[model samples]
Target: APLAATASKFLGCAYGAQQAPGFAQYWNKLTPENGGKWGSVEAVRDQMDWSTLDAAYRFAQANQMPFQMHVMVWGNQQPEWIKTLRPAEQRREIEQWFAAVAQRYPDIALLEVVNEPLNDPPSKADTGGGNYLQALGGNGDSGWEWVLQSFRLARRHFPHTKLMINDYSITSSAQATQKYLQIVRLLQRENLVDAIGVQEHAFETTPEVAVSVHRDNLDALAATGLPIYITEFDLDGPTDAQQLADYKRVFPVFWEHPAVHGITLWGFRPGLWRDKEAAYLIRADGTERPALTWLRDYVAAHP
Candidate 1:
């Protein structure tokens, strides 16, 4: 079968170091590793630099892949200047930032309007924190008022883009899944969200937790009738066999789930967040790991 004959779905990867050597050869969708973060784009208060983001966006467009902006609001990688501003000023800056991205990129397939809201809301800028949550909406009636405000602004600026909210570890247990669902329900009520994103990082997807647990939680989420995406999936390779075993055991659960719309592996080469743990599928010599080759065939056969 032709490589293009994938099922009516996509399995993608993170865009790292501008563009990985053979990214398009495998993945069909693109999500920037850091370039899409508000902090990475605007470290200075008013000086906006988008060189890295531009490269990521242009590469995705050239390859005809869906470009997902990693985030619009996150406590990490947020500009430091916004940390000390008055709440009113911070609100102004946040809106300006949203408008700027909207003006520049109009074809964003998925915009993670808020990232890690349950764990890392932007409340302090002293250390890469945005410190602007209060400015958005300070846990008013709904408890997730700040998140509500984030989507509202996203909808206003990127009127045509698919607005999304992402978080990690929500599927580790049913209790956590319900907690995350509250936020998703809030957004769905207002029609402020288009999709849901969950980062299936190694720690969260540990095989110790029964795969049945994740399946039950996924079923609960799909009840909302919104597509779920595995936003940052990676399996650590302490050794080749271990990585391959885990990939075979775990990858299919998410991939085979009817609710999962797509998946984006964190990265397949070096220089990612898991460099120390060796969570990559490609060696420096450009050889494919067993897991990589297995995935290629599995996806084609399943599709």
Candidate 2:
């Protein structure tokens, strides 16, 4: 029941209760949608809740899917408790967070060391924000010192897992692509990075942007000589034909790129972050949208 074009690469999706039913039949890899965020796991100081994450991990293991931890550090969805703490104590807490994750889940195939650093850094104390960049070495000689520090800490704790840095809009333009490449190369100098993650979410791959632009940027990222994963991919469906048309036009650029190793749809079912925009492939009545059906056929033919 769960077979498609998975011979060359995996096609995965974000995981949760809403994404559980018939998940194995459609996807071969698993990424926690929100359960793995710092705030979701530790909203209160010294308090921990791994139930949601545990379910996702167990599901992935049971189904033999590659488990990718959604993130380790990010501006949003981090514990509020860390915002006001001194840098020293924040560092301790961050290290402890890494150690706890490392000890709890030993088989994480890909660990997103830091997410959205180019666009959103936790440098401010706002709702869902964790202002502790300084704890990780705020802006050193290199502009991405905090990112470098996060990867270093990850290397220490999760030595065996493949480390990745993820961000959105990097593949949408040449300048953004180069900016992201700088950080990837910085991580490379230390032999820290194992892969690159470009989030091709719906907004990033709108019909207005030419797929060629994404293709060229993907080529540049491939030139870095690291495997790329199209993480958090999705397309809006204001209507069936519109969604199918977009999927046909845009999905293949990333799907067919030699540099891309896998694709993790942000979510296909309802309850997704972009549900309001109808950026989902499965409808409420449990029917596959035209875009999803096309994806299945396209993936099979390409493989």
Candidate 3:
């Protein structure tokens, strides 16, 4: 059976971009030198030299891959100018930014509003939670407002796109999950979002716990009747058998769960991950690893 464009299936790449001059895209640790930086809108400054993003976007398009742009907003790696703007100015800036991005591509299938914003931080120095949201005005209601405004502005120019609110650590922490739900509830009340994107980055010790969190978030959020997407997923240091086992353990729950529409893996093989640890379905050497088989078998079995 062939799948429809809107089928409940997706395999996405995060922090994906091409390597073109003036476009040295970076992931996690972006710099002036890294043109195509992830974790910030500044990386896409000008959106003029799109070779970096175009490379990944084209590949996904050709494969009918469900590609999602990680985020349209983030605090770190952002321009200094952003932090200084007044709230009113920030909203205007967001609208203009979305217009620029959507106007240029005109075919972005999806966008996650922010990359896992930490909603509540332990302290000003502690970087674990919602620092950015707090900086702008605690609880993200204002940010969510900007999100709605940006989406509306973008749609006026490019109509066939979906909007998402994404976050990380939600599937591993009860506090994080609950905080996320608060945002979801707000969005639902305002009719502001199309989906919730969960970033699942887990290691061995927390695998089951993380998966449980993922399950619960989707189950609870599903109550709102909104679609769910595993926007970023990767489990590291597991054998082929282990990877398959993990997938079997997790994917089935998602399948049976009513809200989870699909999933996407984030980045780099163990060899090239940010910490030089493995992290993808494919290895850096262009070989299929166990995780790859897990995904292949799962997709094939379902198809």
Candidate 4:
């Protein structure tokens, strides 16, 4: 049986193209990397393009796989026209965008309401677009009013869907984890957040730091009583042996955590993330890497 059949939670990867062989057989969940993004689907406003996203949805429906919408709002990849609008106008546009997405995919299992809030501040220099912060009512004295409002809007739009607040580097940076926890707590207060998403893109950290930081941060997040997700996980290495070794050292921290509900790897094939260095689990010839083999057997044994 595949990991999804044996594990208690969903186990999967970001689907890039329909050509990958093991996707439908081994994974029971999927997250669209770029297809579901605002810029990708609705760059021209009212003229929404559903081709890219519909392909993903079609595959998931055929396979009976649950779909996780990658993100509804982020600082990057936003339509340029949004930046040109006034703050009030921008807010209305955002509401419209949320409504359209929710109505189109009413059955999404999980929805990342906001992504990379802490890292990508809404400055033009950082996000390469307009300041969503100013439009969303900038971070007030509470320090994250914009974040709070974003979740509120997400809740209103996706009343039945599970909403997640997602970010990268949370498993390694203490300051980042603290900020994320603060945001999670605020959302939790109003029952707006459904899950905590931590992207373990562990390319920069050594094996030692990866394990320690992930353990510490996960412990803190688990204390919140919300189900956690290891979203966008991938360990990049210069060598296959090193990658497998790092995978062994770091992958289990979140996988085995009691509070964790699932994991979605960034990508599992070459050119998936367009990063030769970090985002792949399978090679060009459709062969699994050492880490991939280990993950398969490990999940089997765990169940």
Query: On residues 65-167, what C-alpha lDDT tens digit does candidate 1 reach at each position?
Result: 8999988999899998888888899999999999999999999999999999889999865689888889998787999999999999999999889988899
Candidate lDDT (C-alpha), each: 0.88, 0.91, 0.52, 0.79
Best-to-worst TM-score order: 2, 1, 4, 3
Residue pairs clashing in model 4 are: none
- Kindly report which residue pairs in candidate 1 clash with one another: 123-131
Write down the TM-score of every candidate.
Answer: 0.97, 0.98, 0.71, 0.94
Task: Please provide, for model 3 over 13-118, each residue's C-alpha lDDT reduced to its tens digit, 9 standing for 90 to 100.
Answer: 4533321111111121111112222323443333345565566556555554455664465544444444444566755555566666676555566665555456
Score candidate 3 by TM-score against the native: 0.71
Model 2: lDDT of residue 150:
95
Score candidate 3 by lDDT: 0.52
lDDT of 1 at 115: 95
The positional error of residue 115 in candidate 4, measured at the CA in angstroms, is 0.4
Candidate 1 positional error at 243, Å:
0.4
lDDT of 1 at 111: 95
Output the worst ten-in-a-row residue range by lDDT, candidate 1.
Answer: 1-10
- The parts of candidate 4 lying over 4 Å away from their true place are 125-130, 208-210
RMSD of 4: 1.9
User: Could you tell me the TM-score of candidate 4?
Assistant: 0.94
In terms of lDDT, which candidate is strongest? 2
Q: Model 3: residues >4 Å from true position, as ranges?
A: 1-8, 15-49, 62-64, 85-91, 119-160, 173-175, 203-205, 208-213, 238-244, 268-275
